[PDB]
Every structure is written in C-alpha cells, then in structure tokens.
Amino acid sequence: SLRKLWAFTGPGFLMSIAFLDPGNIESDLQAGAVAGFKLLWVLLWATVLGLLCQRLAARLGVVTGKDLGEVCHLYYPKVPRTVLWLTIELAIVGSDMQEVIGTAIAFNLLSAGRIPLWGGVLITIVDTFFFLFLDNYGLRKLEAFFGLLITIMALTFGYEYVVARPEQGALLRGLFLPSCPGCGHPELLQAVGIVGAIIMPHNIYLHSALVKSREIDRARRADIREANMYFLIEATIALSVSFIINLFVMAVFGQAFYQKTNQAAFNICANSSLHDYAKIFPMNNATVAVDIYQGGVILGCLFGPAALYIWAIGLLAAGQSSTMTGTYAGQFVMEGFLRLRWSRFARVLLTRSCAILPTVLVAVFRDLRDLSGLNDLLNVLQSLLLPFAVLPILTFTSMPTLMQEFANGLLNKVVTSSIMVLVCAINLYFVVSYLPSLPHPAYFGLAALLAAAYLGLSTYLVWTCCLAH
C-alpha cells in the first residue's frame, strides 16, 4: 500500500544524502574532467554493488534488532574490535575533511573571493555547533527537512544538466560498454577513487542503525520479511535517484570539459568579468586540472554566473547534509563499538577538531591545488578502507546462528566472495602503484608497516569469513 511505504519512508533519503557527499562531487568532477564518459560503467557497477551491500545491511539490521556495531562488539575479541573501530574512525574523519573542504570552497564561491578559507571553516563549525544548540526545543526527525534539502540540490544539478543539453549517443557507450581503450593509469586512479567514494564504508553501520527506527516484531517472520522488502525497495529508489543525479553531472562535465585546453577556455570566457580567470590559464594547451572552485568558475564563465552561485549553493547543501550524516554515523559507531552513549556531543567535537586542524593548516600554508590533491588522497583512503567495512557484514550475514532461515544463499555467498577478492586485488594493485611514488626513502618502512597491518587485518577477516563460509 501507499501508506505502508510512506511510513517505511525516511531512511532512503538519508543514505542517498550520504551518497551525495562533496567528496563524491569532487571525485566525479575529476573523473569527468579527465576520462569523461569512459568511466560511467564503473559508476554503474560500483552503484549496484553498493545497493547489494546496503541490502545486506538492511537485512541484518532488521532481522537481528541491533546495528552491525553491536554484533561485532558481541563477536570479535577486544583487539580486533578496537582496530576495526579505529578504522571506521579514520574513514569517517576523512569524510569529514571532505565535507569541510567542500563547504569552504562553496563559501569561497559565494563570497566571490572576499572571504578567505579560514573564515569559511570557522563559519561552518559555527553552524555545526548551532545545530548542536538546536537541541533547545528538539522534537525533530530530520527526514522531511533533508528530503527538502536533497530535492533542492537535485533540482539545481538537474537544471544545470538540462541547460547544458548533452547528447546521449556517447552516453550509450559510456553507460553500457565496460571498457576504456586509450586511457591510462590516472584513469584507473580516478576509477578506484569513484568506486570507493560512491560506497561510503560508514553507510553500512548507518543503515544498520536506522533500521531500528521502524517498530519490527522479531517473533513474526512474515512482518520482518515485509519490512525487509520495503527497505530494499526504498534503498533501490534512493540509489536510482543518486545514480540519475550522477548521470546528469557526468554528462555535463564530460561534455564541457573533455579535450578542453586552458587558453581555449580563457579565450572563450574572458569577455566576461569573473576576475578569477588568473589561475586557469598557464598559457599552454594541456588538460585542465579542475577542483570545485575551478569547476564552478568555469561553469559560470561558460553559461553565466548564476550557474556558479547555484552550484556553490548545492555544494553547501551537500556539505551540511554530509556533516549531519557523518555525525549520526559516528554516534552509532560509538554506541556499537564502545556503548559510550552520548548525544551528538563528543562525536561532533572530535570530528570537527580532527577536520579543522589539517584544513586550517593547509589553508594557512598551501593553495587550493593542494586541497584538491588532499581530497583525492582522502577518497583514495576511503576506497582503501571500504573492504574493512564490507567484509565484517559479509561474515555476520554468513553464519546461520543469528539467521537460521534468513541466511545467505549459495549464489549470494559466491558473488560476495568474488567482489571481496576483486576489491582486495584492487587495493593490492593501488598500493603497488603507490610503492614507487615515495619521494623520500625514509617512508619505505612506514609504508611497509602500514601495508603489513592492512594485509594482516584483511587475512584475519578472511579467516573469519571462511570459518563462517
């Protein structure tokens, strides 16, 4: 019925908001800038795998009555839960750095260069603890508020895409054909980055926590099956919305960015009066390395400054939404792995601090290209940390002790094993690419130790899963 779906509605907008974090925005920015339409099939495969993973998360959370954090606390011994919890902590703080840089760039774009970066970060942390102050008369649930916000930003991106008017002929091969002849290693780097960024590792915990919101009676199996199917339908709808918005941004950015040289863009939109044109043109015909600031200024110079202001508004909305979803996710990590049970205080304090330090340092002593590189490294780190969040769920839905009936079938088991070996191989190849890239020989030992710890934790989790397999 429509009323039952309306009652079950509310989470899907939340995971979609998490999917539309500013880190995803920068990642698809760079992907469209460099490879263009050749990586859309990567986006499709990553999105469908994320949908499968969140289906598993919703299934586990609804059926067991507790989030995945509680079950890993119940199962694993002390040291593995501690290490894994620090893993989600690192992933979530990386996401926080992503969204704070996004908000800072958006505020820079609103100010038209008048307000510097430190002003942006201070005002966004002020707004964050203003949201904390909102507890004065807090009776809110955020679902309608942030559905309105996501619809707003979706309408902005859709209007930008439609006024761009792309042609779907190339989109056919981009979406359908799973290959990329003629591209190179940076294309692989951005593909891995988009794969990691589209599937936020913390979203598994986030959904496994929000499942409790609806009243589920675990005694009756038909009711929990209906709840699971409703949650799957809602997740499918949310993922479809996320993918269509990503399709819009992919098409427009690939059409407006591919084989575009710096001096050509400068000549095209030098008749206008942005006054930000200085950075774009180093008087050479080469690929235009573009961040959110440069992307917005280029869109405004090609189509009109309205494009820029609305783009920055969408970026600010995405940053606020991602900040909120990170706060909720991290609170649930606290209650799952330590049962610390705070109310939005300690998590937000630690996250905003661990974000403000590096970004304030990079704003004081580095330029915006360093910010773009830092976000690249952040979303690469998110990709590297993804298996540490996709394997525990695989294990915990593997064994039948929690789910005698609602276990994993043979087809799901083998498919999930295939994806887990695929992602582990991807991480191995990426770290192999990273090994010869160290400028200083002193980092060899640190990189080797970090890789050894990563492989050891991965092999321990694989041993646990094969025991559960």
Numbering used by the authors: 54 to 522
The article reads:
Iron and manganese are essential nutrients whose transport across membranes is catalyzed by members of the SLC11 family. In humans, this protein family contains two paralogs, the ubiquitously expressed DMT1, which is involved in the uptake and distribution of Fe2+ and Mn2+, and NRAMP1, which participates in the resistance against infections and nutrient recycling. We show that both proteins catalyze selective metal ion transport coupled to the symport of H+, but additionally also mediate uncoupled H+ flux. Their structures, while sharing general properties with known prokaryotic homologs, display distinct features that lead to stronger transition metal ion selectivity.
As in case of NRAMP1 the low yield of the protein in detergent solution has complicated sybody selection, we have attempted structure determination of this paralog without fiducial markers by combining 57’783 micrographs from five datasets. These data have allowed us to identify two distinct conformations of the transporter in the same sample. One structure reconstructed at a nominal resolution of 3.9 Å is equivalent to the conformation observed for DMT1, as illustrated in the RMSD of 0.5 Å obtained from a superposition of Cα-atoms. Whereas one of the structures obtained for NRAMP1 (NRAMP1occ) closely resembles the occluded conformation obtained for its paralog DMT1, a second population of particles reside in a distinct conformation that is distinguished by an outward movement of α-helix 1a and concomitant changes of α4 and 5 leading to the dissociation of tight contacts between α1a, α5 and α8 and the consequent opening of an intracellular aqueous path towards the binding site. The correspondence of equivalent structures of the two human SLC11 paralogs to an occluded state is illustrated by the inaccessibility of the region harboring the conserved ion binding site from either side of the membrane. With respect to their conformations, the two human paralogs presumably display intermediates on the transport cycle, which in case of the occluded structures of DMT1 and NRAMP1 would be placed between outward-open and inward-occluded conformations found in the prokaryotic transporter DraNRAMP, where the intracellular gate precluding access to the metal binding site has closed while the extracellular gate has not yet opened.
